[PDB]
Design an enzyme around this catalytic site. Sequence first.
Site, short mmCIF file in Angstrom:
data_model
loop_
_atom_site.label_atom_id
_atom_site.label_comp_id
_atom_site.label_asym_id
_atom_site.label_seq_id
_atom_site.Cartn_x
_atom_site.Cartn_y
_atom_site.Cartn_z
NE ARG A 1 6.75 -6.90 -8.13
CZ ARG A 1 5.69 -7.56 -7.62
NH1 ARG A 1 5.47 -8.85 -7.90
NH2 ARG A 1 4.85 -6.93 -6.80
CG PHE B 1 5.15 -10.35 -1.13
CD1 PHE B 1 4.02 -11.13 -1.00
CD2 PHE B 1 5.23 -9.46 -2.19
CE1 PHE B 1 3.01 -11.07 -1.94
CE2 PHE B 1 4.22 -9.39 -3.12
CZ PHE B 1 3.11 -10.20 -2.99
CD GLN C 1 6.17 -11.47 -10.75
OE1 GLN C 1 5.95 -10.70 -9.82
NE2 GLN C 1 5.69 -11.27 -11.97
CG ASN D 1 -3.21 -12.69 -12.25
OD1 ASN D 1 -3.49 -11.53 -11.92
ND2 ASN D 1 -3.61 -13.73 -11.55
CG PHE E 1 4.13 -15.53 -6.97
CD1 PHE E 1 3.09 -15.30 -7.81
CD2 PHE E 1 3.85 -15.72 -5.62
CE1 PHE E 1 1.78 -15.28 -7.34
CE2 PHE E 1 2.58 -15.71 -5.17
CZ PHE E 1 1.54 -15.48 -6.03
CG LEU F 1 -1.52 -12.56 -3.54
CD1 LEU F 1 -0.09 -13.02 -4.00
CD2 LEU F 1 -2.07 -11.40 -4.37
CG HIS G 1 -2.28 -14.26 -8.01
ND1 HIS G 1 -1.34 -13.75 -8.87
CD2 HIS G 1 -2.89 -13.20 -7.44
CE1 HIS G 1 -1.35 -12.43 -8.79
NE2 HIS G 1 -2.29 -12.07 -7.94
#
Length: 173
Positions: free
Chosen positions: A63, A68, A71, A110, A121, A130, A134
């Site tokens: 992903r 951004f 991952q 997560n 990531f 985040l 995370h």
Amino acid sequence: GEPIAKKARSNPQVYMDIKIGNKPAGRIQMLLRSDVVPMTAENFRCLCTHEKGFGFKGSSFHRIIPQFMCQGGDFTNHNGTGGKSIYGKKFDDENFILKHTGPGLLSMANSGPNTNGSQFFLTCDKTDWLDGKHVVFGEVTEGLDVLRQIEAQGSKDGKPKQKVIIADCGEYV
């Protein structure tokens, strides 16, 4: 027993050789912040060396969303749903001391609090929304250039345009 302020504990350097399409794209090198998050850092380090009999080698970045993050880390189901830690299927959020301050940081993926496994990531932006959710636990020290090439395979939705694979990975000395 005695009042002190401890020295920063030694920080391991790890690496990932990356394959885009099926073409070597080069090596990302990462410093793991054991000094702040030793439990999270040790997991990732083991998963790079394969010393427990399992780990990131052969797994993909499944992903990749441009501007951004990228991952990866699902080496159990190989479909974006899996992964496990050296401590068990999941483990706790160690702390949130480190922040998503900019590009080239390692943080754990997560599905809510205390659900870390293997999936992680690499940031491509300040992803500060985040912070507190995370666990950030490292940074890229070489091969920002290679991460850009991973990022350039992203979509708005996240499906990668070509297979991006951790062909090999390890720890430096």
